[PDB]
Amino acid sequence: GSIARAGKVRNQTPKVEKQEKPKALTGRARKRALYERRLEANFRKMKMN
RNA sequence: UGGGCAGGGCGAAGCCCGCGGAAACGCAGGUGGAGGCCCCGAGCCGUUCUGACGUGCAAUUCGAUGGCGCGACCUGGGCGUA
RNA sequence: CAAGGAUUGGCUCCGGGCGCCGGAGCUGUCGCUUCCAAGGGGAAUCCGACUGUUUAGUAAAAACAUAGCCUUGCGCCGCACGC
RNA sequence: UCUCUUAAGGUAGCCAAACGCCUCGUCAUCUAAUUAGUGACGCGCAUGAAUGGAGCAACGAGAUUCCCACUGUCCCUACCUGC
RNA sequence: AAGCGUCCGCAGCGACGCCGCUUUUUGAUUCUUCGAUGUCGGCUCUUCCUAGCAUGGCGUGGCAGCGCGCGCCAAGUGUUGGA
RNA sequence: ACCAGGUUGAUUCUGCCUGACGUGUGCGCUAGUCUUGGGGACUUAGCCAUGCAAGCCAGCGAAGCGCGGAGCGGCGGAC
RNA sequence: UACCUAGGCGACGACGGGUGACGGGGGGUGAGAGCCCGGAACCGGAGAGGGAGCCUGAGAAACAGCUCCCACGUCCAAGGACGGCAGCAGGCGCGGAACUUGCCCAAUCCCGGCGGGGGAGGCAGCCACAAGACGUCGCACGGCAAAGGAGUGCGACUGGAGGGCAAGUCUGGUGCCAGCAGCCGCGAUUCCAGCUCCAGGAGCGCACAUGAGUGUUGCUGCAGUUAAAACGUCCGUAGUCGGCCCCGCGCUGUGAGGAAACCGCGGGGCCCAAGGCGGCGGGCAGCACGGGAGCGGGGGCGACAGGAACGGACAACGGCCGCGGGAUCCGGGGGCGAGAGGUGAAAAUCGGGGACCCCGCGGGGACGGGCGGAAGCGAAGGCGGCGGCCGGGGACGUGUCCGUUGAUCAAGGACGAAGGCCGGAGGAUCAAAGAUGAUUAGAUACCGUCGUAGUUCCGGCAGUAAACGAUGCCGACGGGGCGAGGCCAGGGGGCUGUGUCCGGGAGAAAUUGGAGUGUUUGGGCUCUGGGGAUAGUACGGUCGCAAGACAGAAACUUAAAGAAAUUGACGGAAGGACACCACAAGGAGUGGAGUGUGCGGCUUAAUUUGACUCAACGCGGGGCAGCUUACCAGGGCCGGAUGCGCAGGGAGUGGUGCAUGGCCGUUUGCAACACGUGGGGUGACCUGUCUGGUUGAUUCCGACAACGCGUGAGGCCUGGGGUGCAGCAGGCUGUGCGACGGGCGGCGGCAAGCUGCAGGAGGGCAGGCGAAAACAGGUCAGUGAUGCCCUCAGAUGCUCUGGGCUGCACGCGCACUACAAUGGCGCGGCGAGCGGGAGUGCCGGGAGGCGCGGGCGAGGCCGUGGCGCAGCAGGGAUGGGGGCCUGGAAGGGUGCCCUGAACGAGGAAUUCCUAGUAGCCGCGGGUCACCAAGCCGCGGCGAAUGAGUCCCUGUUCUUUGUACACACCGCCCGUCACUACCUAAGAUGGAUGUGCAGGCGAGGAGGCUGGGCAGGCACCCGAGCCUGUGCAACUAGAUAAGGUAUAAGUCGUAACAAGGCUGCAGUAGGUGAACCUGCGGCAGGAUCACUA
Ligand SMILES: [Mg+2]
Ligand SMILES: [Mg+2]
Ligand SMILES: [Mg+2]
Ligand SMILES: [Mg+2]
Ligand SMILES: [Mg+2]
Ligand SMILES: [Mg+2]
Ligand SMILES: [Mg+2]
Ligand SMILES: [Mg+2]
Ligand SMILES: [Mg+2]
Ligand SMILES: [Mg+2]
Ligand SMILES: [Mg+2]
Ligand SMILES: [Mg+2]
Ligand SMILES: [Mg+2]
Ligand SMILES: [Mg+2]
Ligand SMILES: [Mg+2]
Ligand SMILES: [Mg+2]
Ligand SMILES: [Mg+2]
Ligand SMILES: [Mg+2]
Ligand SMILES: [Mg+2]
Ligand SMILES: [Mg+2]
Ligand SMILES: [Mg+2]
Ligand SMILES: [Mg+2]
Ligand SMILES: [Mg+2]
Ligand SMILES: [Mg+2]
Ligand SMILES: [Mg+2]
Ligand SMILES: [Mg+2]
Ligand SMILES: [Mg+2]
Ligand SMILES: [Mg+2]
Ligand SMILES: [Mg+2]
């Protein structure tokens, strides 16, 4: 039965929770909070992550 | 060598005309009247009733039903085959 | 005549291409091929192709015949499409 | 695939068929119910190719089953007429 | 009466064996019939038997009831329509 | 007025698939405010409890106690 | 309705069917042409459960009116009475899918002659359904029919992070599982989470549909040689298209009239915006007016339009008649005398009953060789001896005629190879089927033999081909060259066919005078294609005697299938070249025997383990008594540091060489590899790097769209021989010289070079380094080279002891010693090189021992004595007893005596080798306490034979083929067998819609009447039911056939290479199955090629 493989390998996932939230700014504020990063690298060819 | 065998039905070729077609031809309406065609009359026969009868009308008949009914027929006489 | 349906009398007319055909009207206790005469039909199977033939007197058949198909013999026959 | 054996090993077809013993075969259909009928299936006792096989258009007083309609065949008899 | 039947041989069964009865099966035989006793089934119609299916009365149960089993007496009346 | 990925060892094609965009129908997750619009058309022109949806009047004017409002009459209900 | 005409419509698509179809204003989407949608505001239509009939009224065939029928539903006191929400809310059901049983006539309007009514309608509520704008709690005010909101007024998800596609080769889990992913794809950069990041953002994702993407529907604007696709040919009607000159209609301009919404535009500070509101526009192949051109009508030309005529030619054009040719086969005669036939080889078969062969005669059918070709003709299929008849044909020539008669085609008609079918005739060859003889693993095939249909003719059917130029017809235009057509002209000429070559242009390319004049896209007409598979299959139809033909889907399934070319690889393709992991000519062998050793297997407590074709198997320098040593039985010991029992380091001959480094092997015993620049091609690529010749060599000569370089090869380095000088003492080691293929002869000549001889010590001496690319080669067991995984105290650590690595029914590799007389044994004699350390005296029979201590030499050969063909004095295996050596320890070694095995020349197979070589023969070194039958070296003796060839194996090159690219151990086809899905068939059915026809027939208007509000009668409308039937669409079904997908199992191997029988399609038959066979085609062939 391969459905016996279906649930325990789902249950083989470890559960690592969320961090404490640095409540993320929304809207034009986030569009500025990425635009600060767009000017730090002189534009192109930017490593974003 | 003679003779016998209602009446209908279906509608084959061929033909005529109309329509269609470039042509080949195709439809349609008449005409025609073929066929071991169809229903059947006289007649013939013998399917069924396993009817009647079954010391009978009759040493095989009767009735109804049925089949055939211009034929590969039936029939008188003559003749042949014992 | 696949199956299946409608109609059908009498009378009085009208029309036609007038031995007949079509139509209309009237009429009967709805009834009309009025008696007589006169197919029951459908779906299939088996067998024999068919029409025909047969056990006169228990069998009419699927049997026999048939055309077709085939084989055989025969050039001393009726003459090979022949017997 | 191997092997034995025959003159050759049943081909195309067709079938519990009028040909199947088992057998009222098995499945389907038909029915309330079917040893029947039909359609399938085929290791077919013992189907099969002019000893003709398969095939059903048409035909049939042939053999068989179902349906419709019909009916004294029956339920279940009764009455009438002639002789 | 080995065993089964919750325990329990006999409520009801009952192996292994044994004893009978019947002439409703089929044999066995060949006594009667071959100078013929019409041979299956059905239909029809009457009667008889009981080894009793129903109906009447009972006894028994591992019979609460309902039902079912087992046994007894009794042959009066019954014992169908179909594919 | 646009292409991109995908057949191959690589190539050039044909070729279709897929991505990329709008639209409307439904689903899903999510959601602070306001304005505006839409909403049992698709399947079932399926079935319907209950209430309401088309009434009105000036002619004549009864009961009832001049007021009155019944019925007749009229108009609409076919929009 | 009565009577009478025979009409009416249709490929300009009638009629019938379908529609999950109300139409339109419009909407969506695209640059546009278009495509798609319009339930939905407004307009028109239609309906009120299905129907039908009607009353009233101006208006209804009304339905929140009536009458009846039908289907559902309700109440009843059982007599009867009712219900039609496709009105508004609301409920149920349906489904993916859609709101409150709220308030009110305040606004918009309607009915009513006003006070009234209005679920029309508005307001609010519900809903992220949509558009727009903007962020990350309670008074007063305000508005409101009323309330609430607006307006003052105070106190962050959604999806993703491999590519397309923006953003992670971070962390943990998962290990082809789970899962993810539109496509490609991943199995940890793709799963599941965390983080971070990206995208859009109060929104976002998904599914479905549609548009664009798409010039993949092509009017604009495709494609049809080979990718899917020109119908076999010709005729042919509608249709569509169509020469020149010389009032009507098309077309077109403006204008009318045409609803708003909408849309386009324009304003317009609703706070902005979407808006509101106001301007202006568009729409229509209808109408009116205008229009210089175009078309008709009618004449005139007579078209490098056509038809007709004529002329001389030309013609494998057809039909028929006649003549003829030789060959195959048969009959018959004569000769001959043993075979013949047939094959890769044979067999079957016929042969003294005279075959075969030779010669004559005869009969019969079929067939035209050579000439015969990129030559002719025909519309295609097709047409080939000769003569004649009848008929036809195109081209040419022409002041001949006609004058637009034309082009192309649905429908229709005719012809149409082979095979097939029918009837008749005939039957020589060949030959499906069938039968045999072989081949083969099998062989139903290929090969041999035989043989029926058939092949042949006549009359008909059939109507198909790779019917191909895989290329429709007509027409205009477009480069040269060479040809072997026909006619004409006479002036390397013109017409018309026909090939070919080179360019242009085109094309994805191969290629191509059309496949050109194509995004600068438009000549006409017809047909076809729209990813693959299903499938040219099914159903229906038409045709056919049948075979089948024509025509022609879908369900399900799939991300590729395909084209042309490039580079490889491969080929039972051709041609080369080369080699003792080749062969010939040879030599010695191996495999046989015993032993030594290695491998497997088995056993075992363990018999550690790597490696298994060359490139595993005396290999791991692997000759193991301990150690080595990884294994087994035990015992010790903790190199378990370090950071506050845990963390973590460290260790491991534990695992993984498919995680690696390094090294080594193999391709190699090769000759290949690459760059710079330029050229060819759209490109991958090619040239350079080569036709040929040459070389061990891609070494060079040479021609060359290449030119120059670079690795490798060579040069080189070491040893070897000859001697010049120098130095010094089994003579030693420095420095040079010496050979280069130089000279000569002959081939080849820009030659490179090859080959013989002379000269010479020497004319390919032996090694060394050794390119690029690979391989899942080997090594984690060389490593203080190592990632990762596992183990770490009862250890997979280290160490000790014992055992094993040495076990043994057996299979195998490599060697050793032999089988003897070319020998063996016993003495005497002569005796090497590498290596240069070792000898000596004494004891002992030997092995060995002891003490000093600068210090070595073999088998053999020669001479000679014995044995004397014998399992023998060959052989020395096995075993017994004794003596020693090494070591802690003998299974080790050595020595002595004795025992004395197989083996009498070794099956199929198979290795190595060309001169001081093979072989024989020892010696020394590595390993080593002890030990070599091994390895690496060394010398002694010393051949045979080729001076080659690709036969066999391989490698390599050229050309070619390829459906291979994991690269032939590849790819691939079909049956069988299992499961799943789907479609068609299928006796027997089943249910629904709809239309006809008939039967019965409720009700009802009007008329005629009446117990004059009843009832009756006839007519008319007519539901509803019943029966029969048509059409449309659906479904059950025993059985049975396909298709597709399965995990791929069995059987083969049909195709791809000459795929091992060239392939393919047609047709016919046959076979388990791909398929085989016959006939005729075709090249898409393995041939562009020969009396030139
Ligand atoms: Mg007759
Ligand atoms: Mg008769
Ligand atoms: Mg008679
Ligand atoms: Mg009749
Ligand atoms: Mg009939
Ligand atoms: Mg008969
Ligand atoms: Mg008789
Ligand atoms: Mg016959
Ligand atoms: Mg059979
Ligand atoms: Mg039966
Ligand atoms: Mg019966
Ligand atoms: Mg026979
Ligand atoms: Mg028989
Ligand atoms: Mg008869
Ligand atoms: Mg008697
Ligand atoms: Mg008697
Ligand atoms: Mg509709
Ligand atoms: Mg609409
Ligand atoms: Mg093609
Ligand atoms: Mg002779
Ligand atoms: Mg032919
Ligand atoms: Mg023929
Ligand atoms: Mg014939
Ligand atoms: Mg032959
Ligand atoms: Mg068909
Ligand atoms: Mg190709
Ligand atoms: Mg040890
Ligand atoms: Mg060794
Ligand atoms: Mg082949």
Side-chain angles (χ1 to χ4, degrees), chain A residues 1 4 6-7 14 22 24-49:
Chain A
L25 77 175
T26 66
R28 60 173 177 86
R30 184 179 172 183
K31 292 299 178 294
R32 285 285 201 183
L34 274 307
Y35 189 70
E36 54 88 21
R37 195 180 294 170
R38 183 253 178 267
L39 265 70
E40 290 163 3
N42 191 0
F43 280 13
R44 293 151 181 174
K45 188 68 74 176
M46 160 174 176
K47 180 74 172 181
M48 287 183 179
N49 195 22

